[PDB]
């Protein structure tokens, strides 16, 4: 998955990972990545996008990223 | 998709069939014992049975006309079983002799002997003496010395 392909296309990348954002009864997030090619791709300069960087930091195999520079009232009812 | 992916699995297994069949002869290259070109087998989409040309070449180089003499042997077995003849008489080869010793060894038959159509023996050809010869021939040249066995 480079910049060219879409989300669901056939990709040379092996895994975005075993992933399940749905909460599951306790320890609510999923099991994380399978491994050993994730470090190769992030080593090779393949970029992460914003939330995979948050998820990789949150799993603690990478350090986390601070998101907010300022606060203005976000609307939670947009959905 | 496994049809596409499982093509070349037997390709790397064919190469040691070449090397352990023919030391010093080299996708694989197959020298059938016929015209001088070694005959080539290699990849496609539809997966291949690698070791048909190597396996066939080892067969025909060790035992020449393996297919025709094997089918002739087993065809004559089928012949006289369905015709009630209890004797089975073949144009012999290396294959017919060796695999007749095989099926006598396993006891599919009870025995074999070389025979000769003795009416058209000459004034003196060589003639098969069963007693004075040792009991079991084991090569073609001893069984192609004479005339029309």
């Amino acid at each position: 998955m480079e910049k060219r392909q879409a989300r669901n296309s056939g990709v040379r990348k092996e895994d975005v990972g075993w992933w399940d954002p749905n909460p599951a009864a306790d320890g609510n997030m999923h099991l994380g990545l399978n491994f050993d090619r994730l470090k190769y791709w992030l080593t090779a300069g393949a970029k992460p996008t914003d939330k995979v960087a948050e998820l990789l930091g949150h799993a603690g195999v990478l350090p986390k990223v601070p998101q907010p520079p300022h606060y203005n009232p976000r609307d939670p009812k947009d959905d | 998709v496994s049809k596409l992916r499982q093509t070349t699995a037997t390709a790397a297994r064919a190469a040691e069939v070449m090397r352990a069949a023919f030391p010093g002869a080299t996708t694989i290259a197959v020298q059938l014992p016929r015209k001088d070109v070694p005959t080539y087998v290699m990849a496609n989409q539809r997966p291949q049975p690698w070791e048909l040309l190597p396996m066939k070449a080892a067969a025909m180089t060790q035992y020449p006309n393996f297919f025709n003499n094997s089918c002739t042997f087993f065809g004559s077995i089928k012949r006289d079983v369905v015709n009630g003849v209890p004797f089975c008489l073949l144009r012999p080869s290396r294959l017919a002799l060796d695999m007749a010793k095989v099926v006598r060894n396993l006891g599919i038959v009870d025995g074999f002997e070389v025979v000769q159509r003795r009416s058209r023996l000459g004034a003196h050809d060589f003639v098969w003496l069963p007693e004075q010869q040792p009991q079991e021939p084991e090569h073609l040249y001893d069984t192609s010395l004479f005339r029309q066995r």
Binding site: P23, A25, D26, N28, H58, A59 | -
Partner: protein
């Protein structure tokens, strides 16, 4: 298997995907660790081992 099934006896998802609850880490069972919100590495809670074993 019978003793395990006998001794068994949130889902709001709607996800705007927020990273609220802690995270657990062919897939290599048993799971490796639990990653919390606070950057802490911890082994599995007992209940989490139970529902990992229910998941299979």
């Amino acid at each position: 298997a019978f003793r395990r099934d006998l001794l068994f006896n949130a889902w709001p998802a709607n996800l705007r995907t927020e990273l609220t609850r802690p995270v657990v880490v062919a897939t290599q069972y048993p799971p490796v660790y639990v990653a919390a919100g606070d950057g802490a590495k911890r082994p599995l809670n007992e209940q989490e081992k139970v529902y990992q074993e229910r998941r299979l």
